[PDB]
Design an enzyme around this catalytic site. Structure first.
Site, PDB file in Angstrom:
ATOM      1  N   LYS A 110      -5.216 -12.530 -16.518  1.00 15.38           N
ATOM      2  CA  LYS A 110      -4.966 -13.730 -15.708  1.00 15.38           C
ATOM      3  C   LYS A 110      -3.632 -13.543 -15.006  1.00 15.38           C
ATOM      4  O   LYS A 110      -2.641 -13.134 -15.634  1.00 15.38           O
ATOM      5  CB  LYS A 110      -4.907 -14.979 -16.592  1.00 15.38           C
ATOM      6  CG  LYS A 110      -5.170 -16.288 -15.826  1.00 15.38           C
ATOM      7  CD  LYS A 110      -6.590 -16.323 -15.284  1.00 15.38           C
ATOM      8  CE  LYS A 110      -7.248 -17.645 -15.528  1.00 15.38           C
ATOM      9  NZ  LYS A 110      -8.709 -17.560 -15.239  1.00 15.38           N
TER      10      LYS A 110
ATOM     11  N   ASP B 260      -9.755 -17.202 -18.866  1.00 11.70           N
ATOM     12  CA  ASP B 260      -9.420 -18.600 -19.141  1.00 11.70           C
ATOM     13  C   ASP B 260      -8.731 -18.776 -20.498  1.00 11.70           C
ATOM     14  O   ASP B 260      -7.795 -19.555 -20.632  1.00 11.70           O
ATOM     15  CB  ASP B 260     -10.664 -19.488 -19.062  1.00 11.70           C
ATOM     16  CG  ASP B 260     -10.315 -20.963 -19.066  1.00 11.70           C
ATOM     17  OD1 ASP B 260      -9.864 -21.467 -18.013  1.00 11.70           O
ATOM     18  OD2 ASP B 260     -10.475 -21.607 -20.125  1.00 11.70           O
TER      19      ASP B 260
ATOM     20  N   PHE C 124      28.362   5.112   8.650  1.00 15.37           N
ATOM     21  CA  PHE C 124      27.303   6.079   8.525  1.00 15.37           C
ATOM     22  C   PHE C 124      27.455   7.164   9.570  1.00 15.37           C
ATOM     23  O   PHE C 124      27.106   6.989  10.724  1.00 15.37           O
ATOM     24  CB  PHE C 124      25.899   5.402   8.576  1.00 15.37           C
ATOM     25  CG  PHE C 124      24.777   6.329   8.176  1.00 15.37           C
ATOM     26  CD1 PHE C 124      24.710   6.841   6.871  1.00 15.37           C
ATOM     27  CD2 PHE C 124      23.813   6.745   9.106  1.00 15.37           C
ATOM     28  CE1 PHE C 124      23.696   7.732   6.504  1.00 15.37           C
ATOM     29  CE2 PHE C 124      22.802   7.627   8.741  1.00 15.37           C
ATOM     30  CZ  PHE C 124      22.743   8.137   7.444  1.00 15.37           C
TER      31      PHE C 124
ATOM     32  N   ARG D 141      29.955  -0.745  10.694  1.00 14.43           N
ATOM     33  CA  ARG D 141      28.660  -1.402  10.989  1.00 14.43           C
ATOM     34  C   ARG D 141      28.437  -2.538  10.009  1.00 14.43           C
ATOM     35  O   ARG D 141      29.110  -2.644   8.997  1.00 14.43           O
ATOM     36  CB  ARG D 141      27.509  -0.398  10.896  1.00 14.43           C
ATOM     37  CG  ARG D 141      27.256   0.081   9.482  1.00 14.43           C
ATOM     38  CD  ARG D 141      26.121   1.079   9.420  1.00 14.43           C
ATOM     39  NE  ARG D 141      25.866   1.456   8.016  1.00 14.43           N
ATOM     40  CZ  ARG D 141      24.812   2.140   7.579  1.00 14.43           C
ATOM     41  NH1 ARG D 141      23.877   2.610   8.423  1.00 14.43           N
ATOM     42  NH2 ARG D 141      24.707   2.400   6.274  1.00 14.43           N
TER      43      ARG D 141
ATOM     44  N   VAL E  70      23.907   3.747   2.269  1.00 15.97           N
ATOM     45  CA  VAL E  70      23.287   2.938   1.237  1.00 15.97           C
ATOM     46  C   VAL E  70      23.146   3.784  -0.028  1.00 15.97           C
ATOM     47  O   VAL E  70      23.382   3.303  -1.142  1.00 15.97           O
ATOM     48  CB  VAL E  70      21.912   2.427   1.750  1.00 15.97           C
ATOM     49  CG1 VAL E  70      21.129   1.742   0.634  1.00 15.97           C
ATOM     50  CG2 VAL E  70      22.177   1.448   2.905  1.00 15.97           C
TER      51      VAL E  70
ATOM     52  N   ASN F  41      17.252  -1.444   4.329  1.00 16.24           N
ATOM     53  CA  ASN F  41      18.424  -1.459   5.170  1.00 16.24           C
ATOM     54  C   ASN F  41      18.009  -2.363   6.346  1.00 16.24           C
ATOM     55  O   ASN F  41      17.209  -1.948   7.172  1.00 16.24           O
ATOM     56  CB  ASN F  41      18.801  -0.015   5.562  1.00 16.24           C
ATOM     57  CG  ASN F  41      20.126   0.061   6.312  1.00 16.24           C
ATOM     58  OD1 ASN F  41      20.838  -0.945   6.450  1.00 16.24           O
ATOM     59  ND2 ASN F  41      20.463   1.261   6.811  1.00 16.24           N
TER      60      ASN F  41
ATOM     61  N   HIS G 149      18.530  -4.020   9.628  1.00 19.17           N
ATOM     62  CA  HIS G 149      19.410  -3.630  10.726  1.00 19.17           C
ATOM     63  C   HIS G 149      19.801  -4.783  11.619  1.00 19.17           C
ATOM     64  O   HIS G 149      18.987  -5.643  11.938  1.00 19.17           O
ATOM     65  CB  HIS G 149      18.754  -2.537  11.582  1.00 19.17           C
ATOM     66  CG  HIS G 149      18.241  -1.374  10.789  1.00 19.17           C
ATOM     67  ND1 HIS G 149      19.076  -0.452  10.190  1.00 19.17           N
ATOM     68  CD2 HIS G 149      16.977  -1.003  10.466  1.00 19.17           C
ATOM     69  CE1 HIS G 149      18.343   0.460   9.566  1.00 19.17           C
ATOM     70  NE2 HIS G 149      17.068   0.137   9.698  1.00 19.17           N
TER      71      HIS G 149
HETATM   72  O1  LIG Z   1      22.830   4.044   4.933  1.00 22.26           O
HETATM   73  C1  LIG Z   1      22.000   4.620   5.646  1.00 22.26           C
HETATM   74  N1  LIG Z   1      21.218   5.555   5.053  1.00 22.26           N
HETATM   75  C2  LIG Z   1      20.311   6.259   5.717  1.00 22.26           C
HETATM   76  O2  LIG Z   1      19.572   7.104   5.181  1.00 22.26           O
HETATM   77  C3  LIG Z   1      20.152   5.951   7.153  1.00 22.26           C
HETATM   78  N2  LIG Z   1      19.359   6.461   8.102  1.00 22.26           N
HETATM   79  N3  LIG Z   1      19.657   5.796   9.266  1.00 22.26           N
HETATM   80  N4  LIG Z   1      20.661   4.862   9.045  1.00 22.26           N
HETATM   81  C4  LIG Z   1      21.021   4.923   7.746  1.00 22.26           C
HETATM   82  N5  LIG Z   1      21.910   4.263   6.975  1.00 22.26           N
HETATM   83  O1  LIG Z   2     -16.390 -12.528 -14.366  1.00 20.24           O
HETATM   84  C1  LIG Z   2     -15.569 -12.958 -15.186  1.00 20.24           C
HETATM   85  N1  LIG Z   2     -14.908 -12.043 -15.937  1.00 20.24           N
HETATM   86  C2  LIG Z   2     -14.025 -12.380 -16.867  1.00 20.24           C
HETATM   87  O2  LIG Z   2     -13.395 -11.550 -17.547  1.00 20.24           O
HETATM   88  C3  LIG Z   2     -13.752 -13.823 -17.031  1.00 20.24           C
HETATM   89  N2  LIG Z   2     -12.948 -14.499 -17.859  1.00 20.24           N
HETATM   90  N3  LIG Z   2     -13.116 -15.832 -17.573  1.00 20.24           N
HETATM   91  N4  LIG Z   2     -14.048 -15.992 -16.557  1.00 20.24           N
HETATM   92  C4  LIG Z   2     -14.492 -14.773 -16.187  1.00 20.24           C
HETATM   93  N5  LIG Z   2     -15.367 -14.320 -15.266  1.00 20.24           N
END
Ligand SMILES: O=c1[nH]c(=O)c2nn[nH]c2[nH]1
Ligand SMILES: O=c1[nH]c(=O)c2nn[nH]c2[nH]1
Ligand SMILES: O=c1[nH]c(=O)c2nn[nH]c2[nH]1
Ligand SMILES: O=c1[nH]c(=O)c2nn[nH]c2[nH]1
Ligand code: NA
Ligand code: NA
Ligand code: NA
Ligand code: NA
Ligand SMILES: [Xe]
Ligand SMILES: [Xe]
Ligand SMILES: [Xe]
Ligand SMILES: [Xe]
Lengths: 295, 295, 295, 295
Positions: free
Chosen positions: D10, D58, D159, D176, D227, D254, D256
């Site tokens: 779930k 459920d 950079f 920058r 970075v 990053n 920009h």
């Molecule tokens: O911090 C950065 N790392 C990168 O790898 C990079 N590539 N373009 N600008 C950048 N700035």
């Molecule tokens: O198709 C279903 N599978 C499940 O495992 C399930 N559990 N509750 N309702 C359900 N319906």
């Protein structure tokens, strides 16, 4: 301290490309979002402020546009493989490239029953994706996926026979709504390099289309015993139709629609066989995953 | 101090309804999100902590489900009018109801060329909406809309001849990409009450379909001089086809796709007639609105 | 057909400005998102493809940056008034400018108990906004607001004595959770022009601070009879503290937290006086609005 | 075909808990979103429609509420370990539980300089998270994180000295803007079980506070060479202050901010030393990751 793992690059690079057929006048558009992350002998940028090993992320961005200008961008498995290979071949100290591509839908419009030459509509937020890992000396690993495919069936889904203990309140049912957002991934056998990826180019679009078709048909036709059982049937069929796939993974939310008891109001009947109005639940949701491979 | 205006109610009420044809076995689903806000003689809840005038928002929620159980939910113009009328008739001191409905797409799946009886797909996040204002003694005002319709054309859009001064850098162009998300609203003539809304029921779906068709066709076929000029052509046509519409309003973002100059890289040509790869811009965006009425 | 209303411009223009005190070395940053829409004698761009009347939206974007370079950007009421006035004075045929500004928080960091000269943190997505309408011959109308202020109190909220009929299931309560996202707007008296706005500059930040303080204190201290009653108390106080405000509007969702009955499980007591664990509800939500003005 | 991996459970379970001190009257609230996924001997639910092995999602939801009722929910590392252990101990055939918790901020309000007993504000969307994997026979693995911490410095970032080739257009810079959203994860040494997690309870909040403090101080004080270099300094310090941490991972966009050349307009100077107004870029963004461990 030591650097155990490092990768860096450019994310969220939006790219559009148009193809113009001069003969027919027909234009075709492609739009993607691309992420490229590099690994290699770059530890000193972290530990010694040695920027000489850094291919600037800005340059990675430029390279994506240049590569799209000079190469086909479809199928995305091929474009991703070209882009990843570029980095490991061009830079001696870069040994892996990780390329993620999300393809956005631009579907040609039908106007008065005929396909329009240059007008398009975004029919749904469904995406086609690829993840391509290009590792020097270990080839090319490709995972292809579809995501954001949202479906609902209003009957022919059941869920009974599950474990009941002191934590259980859920009633067994033989007729419920089933709705999900489909995320399906197929992992290709490892490719030795770009020549081998090129040799299989026609299989990429065909396998995407098959995965989509099998997903929709199985969902619509299965009298579903559970999400688990229906999803396994989908995965089994995809593996049977494409021998170059090694595994299929599905990740499926179970988006619940609850009955609304209205009997407090003039004895109105709106449960079980009389249920017509339901309350869609935004949260919580079931989440069901499985990875299926070959015997 | 005095209360100048007040309204209150329940927002984000998700509702699903299924219709089952017992003869054919065919099921049809509807899913909406509903908001109802009330006005009337309720000032004392604010000024004197007099809760006796408050129809609890929780009760408004119950009423939405009950009304959906007992009435058709389509067309949404009719459902909204029923729901709004209920509140002004049931409660003496409530004099206006404001109903907003968003209809979500559940499109029947085609499996092997035939329509499936009970399986559906969300094809796009396009919505059909209504705003219904029911005011005691002044009838029913309905605004219908479509929203979230995203389109792109790759040529046959121009923009030249605009004002040029010392704030202007934009180059004139005779060939550009045009892409937008369409928000179109048509306002119906005032209706005297529910009987009159019922009398026009067939016009609601037909006018929605016409508005959509005119929007798509005009966008695809117009050699557009500007967003302004193309949108006016759309509005003019809708008003000509449905005499019961008083005004049409369009609100259109201009989602820009920029050329990328690649000439710094080995003289690569990617501008003007050579432009193939473009950079979609997330922001800023043009925003163009117009309301068109009758002479 | 005729153009009944038209406006157009540029939305989502992100702007950052830095102020550097050369004496102290202290830097202060401002970041906003700006939208400017123009109206005037522009109908022919829609009806006749006459672009000569169009100040390009791209030029509007340039003007926003130029204006920010040459003028203070704080308080936003002043910046918006300068920007709107520019358009109506520069262009004979433009007669109204509508300026919306959203101000994003960049709060100076405290490092080891002292304010840092050039490092900032986004503490919450709360926004301070302005809407400025500059209309030729009718002066300047300013609405100031705060939005996205999310609060919760775990007791000292009640809701009983509301209307009960056959649509009502809600139980009366003398102790509940109250949580909301505050949207509060104060509308200034009309200003004759920029000179008058300049004359009141100190009141803008002071009134924002007062509105915020009154909102938080009243929410925390009121033994609330309803959202309606508590919100009115807030509005009354703001109007009492600033005579240049004509109206105050609040729009408040009621974000529900439901009790969870656990008594089915080993008689566990988790309701009424024993309630400890609750389920926050994403939807639906109450929505309560009021506009308060002077007698 | 065969099931290679499977997990289900779930997601998006929202939980609120209140603690009431009867002595002082002070109330403290906690709000989280929880996901629990189970693994074990469940393959037959997928392959044979055998629901007897399924603990219904459920029921997992119910268990989360019951566990929160009966146990402390803070620190989240402890709550997650209790919740995961429950499933592997209660169900013979379930052998792993994966628990993800996101903790939302509810910060006590200060009203007139004093802490309010029962009123809270969401100060920022920064989250504190845990991922707890409880595997039968292999103990408890815990990853703790902070995310959504958004910061900016307006100077003291450089950079220069990066690789320049035919793909490079980026200019070297000695001053920058640097802005990022911090995602920092620390991985604890494996714990043998719940008794051992309990023994270290005081370290969890202390290490979170240290990680946050080191992140903010280092960002504010480092005259950043990149970075990469600044993030490594952060990671090194956290590892030095908590010996029970095995690795620290940072993932930093990053974000920009581009200079705007205004010289085309009356020679206005807005670049280099004269830069005051900048254009924040929504996309693309650099993405820089590193995992730092012990020698
Ligand atoms: O911090 C950065 N790392 C990168 O790898 C990079 N590539 N373009 N600008 C950048 N700035
Ligand atoms: O198709 C279903 N599978 C499940 O495992 C399930 N559990 N509750 N309702 C359900 N319906
Ligand atoms: O404060 C409240 N106001 C209302 O109008 C309401 N309706 N249901 N619960 C409520 N709480
Ligand atoms: O169609 C357009 N309309 C406009 O008003 C505009 N302004 N810049 N570009 C534009 N394109
Ligand atoms: Na290499
Ligand atoms: Na009435
Ligand atoms: Na003017
Ligand atoms: Na077990
Ligand atoms: Xe592309
Ligand atoms: Xe519905
Ligand atoms: Xe700004
Ligand atoms: Xe909680």
């Amino acid at each position: 301290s030591a650097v155990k793992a490092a990768r860096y690059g450019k994310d969220n690079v939006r790219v559009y490309k148009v193809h113009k057929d001069e003969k027919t006048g027909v234009q075709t558009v492609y739009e993607m979002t691309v992420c490229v992350l590099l690994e290699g002998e770059i530890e000193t940028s972290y530990t010694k402020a040695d920027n000489s090993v850094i291919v600037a992320t800005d340059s990675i961005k430029n390279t994506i546009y240049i590569t799209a200008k000079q190469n086909p961008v479809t199928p995305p498995e091929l474009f991703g493989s070209i882009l990843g290979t570029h980095f490991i071949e061009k830079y001696n100290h870069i040994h892996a490239a990780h390329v993620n591509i999300v393809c956005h839908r631009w579907t040609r419009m039908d106007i008065d029953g005929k396909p329009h030459p240059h007008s398009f509509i975004r029919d749904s937020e469904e995406k086609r994706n690829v993840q391509v890992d290009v590792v020097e000396g270990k080839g090319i690993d490709i995972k292809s996926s579809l995501s954001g495919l949202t479906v609902l069936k209003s009957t022919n889904s059941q869920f009974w026979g599950f474990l009941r203990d002191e934590y259980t309140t859920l009633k067994e049912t033989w007729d419920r709504i089933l709705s999900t957002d489909v995320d399906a991934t197929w992992q290709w056998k490892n490719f030795s390099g770009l020549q081998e990826v090129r040799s299989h180019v026609p299989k990429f679009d065909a396998t995407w289309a098959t995965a989509r078709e099998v997903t929709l048909k199985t969902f619509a036709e299965d009298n579903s015993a559970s999400v688990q059982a229906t999803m396994y049937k989908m995965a089994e069929q995809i593996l049977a139709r494409q021998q170059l796939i090694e595994t299929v993974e599905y990740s499926l939310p179970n988006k619940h629609y609850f009955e609304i008891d209205l009997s407090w109001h003039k004895g109105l009947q709106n449960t079980g066989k009389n249920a017509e109005v339901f309350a869609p639940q935004s949260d919580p949701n079931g989440l069901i995953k499985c990875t299926v491979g070959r015997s």
